Amino acid sequence: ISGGDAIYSSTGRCSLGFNVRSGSTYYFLTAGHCTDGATTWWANSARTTVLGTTSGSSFPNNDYGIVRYTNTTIPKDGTVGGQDITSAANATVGMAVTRRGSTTGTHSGSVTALNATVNYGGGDVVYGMIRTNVCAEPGDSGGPLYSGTRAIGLTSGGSGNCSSGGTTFFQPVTEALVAYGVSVY
Amino acid sequence: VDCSEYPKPACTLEYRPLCGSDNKTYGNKCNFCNAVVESNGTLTLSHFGKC
C-alpha cells in the first residue's frame, strides 16, 4: 500500500498520506479529521484486510493523525503510487507540487500561499495551512502532497473540483513528523 | 442532514456519500450542503449512500 491509496475506517474512506516509521515500527500518516474517532483502519471496502489502529490524531487546529500498522505482511512502500519519497521539506510560495488521492488520482499545481487559516465550521478551524491551486474531491482527504521525491503535506480540505478547478489546503507534513518522532523512508 | 450553516468556503474531503435529488452522488455532507445553497434551495436529499 503506498501514498494516495484508499483507506477505510468505520465511518468512510480517506487516502493514506505517507508510510513513516520509527525504529522498527511502521505507521502511516493521514488527515486528523479522518483519524478523529476511528479506531481500526482497513485496506478495502469490505473490511477484510486490516491495516492497523489509530495511534494519534490532531484535529482541529492542526489536521494530521497516524495509524500504527498491525498487518505484518502487507507491503508498506515508501512511495506515492510509484514515485519514491526520500525526504520531507517545507513548502514555499511558487513551488510546483503534486497530490495523489484515492478518488481523483494524481493532480498537479503550485503552492499559492502559506500559513492560511481555514474554517470548516462548528469550531473546526485549522491553522497554518499550505494553500495551492491543486484540485481535490471527497475521498482524497489525507493523501500526500509532494514535489519530486520530497514529501510536503497531507490533504486536508478545499473547494471546487477537478473538472472545473479548485483550491486545496494541506497540513505541512514536517509538523506531523516531528510531533510523532517518525520519518519518511 | 441540515444545511443551515452553509455555505462554507471549504470542506474536509473524507468520502461518506449522499444521493441528491439530481441523481448525483455528493461525496460528503459539506459538499452536498454547499450544492443545496448553490441551487438556492432547490436540490434535496434523496437518500444516504451513493445514488
Side-chain angles (χ1 to χ4, degrees):
Chain A
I1 199 174
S2 78
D5 283 348
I7 54 179
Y8 296 87
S9 59
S10 48
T11 56
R13 166 173 42 104
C14 291
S15 294
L16 190 149
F18 293 96
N19 271 331
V20 301
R21 85 226 250 201
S22 181
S24 61
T25 307
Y26 290 85
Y27 299 81
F28 60 92
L29 301 173
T30 185
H33 64 271
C34 286
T35 54
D36 188 53
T39 55
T40 299
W41 285 87
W42 290 266
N44 52 339
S45 33
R47 282 69 170 172
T48 59
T49 303
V50 178
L51 290 181
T53 45
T54 308
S55 288
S57 182
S58 176
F59 174 79
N61 307 316
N62 292 306
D63 193 357
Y64 57 75
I66 178 161
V67 173
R68 171 182 354 96
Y69 276 112
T70 38
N71 179 140
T72 52
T73 58
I74 189 164
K76 300 163 190 59
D77 297 328
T79 58
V80 170
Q83 164 63 49
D84 191 43
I85 287 307
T86 57
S87 60
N90 281 316
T92 49
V93 179
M95 186 183 272
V97 288
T98 299
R99 172 190 60 69
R100 191 170 180 250
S102 79
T103 290
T104 54
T106 287
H107 289 261
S108 287
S110 72
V111 171
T112 58
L114 299 185
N115 204 236
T117 293
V118 195
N119 176 358
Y120 290 125
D124 277 346
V125 175
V126 305
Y127 298 101
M129 301 313 262
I130 298 167
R131 184 183 173 124
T132 71
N133 65 0
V134 174
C135 54
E137 288 172 10
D140 288 340
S141 274
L145 175 82
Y146 62 101
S147 183
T149 56
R150 304 170 306 162
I152 298 302
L154 298 174
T155 309
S156 161
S159 57
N161 62 56
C162 291
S163 171
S164 48
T167 287
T168 294
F169 291 98
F170 301 78
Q171 158 65 58
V173 77
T174 49
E175 242 223 292
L177 300 176
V178 163
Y180 306 133
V182 304
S183 55
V184 302
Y185 73 83
Chain B
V1 5
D2 148 50
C3 307
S4 82
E5 331 89 281
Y6 275 80
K8 286 147 162 221
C11 292
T12 53
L13 303 173
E14 68 288 2
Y15 187 68
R16 285 160 107 337
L18 312 187
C19 177
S21 55
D22 49 355
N23 310 285
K24 184 181 172 180
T25 285
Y26 292 87
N28 59 35
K29 140 156 217 212
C30 179
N31 270 229
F32 170 71
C33 280
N34 280 328
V36 177
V37 160
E38 154 165 12
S39 67
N40 191 35
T42 51
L43 178 68
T44 53
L45 186 64
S46 184
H47 50 90
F48 302 88
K50 277 177 184 170
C51 287

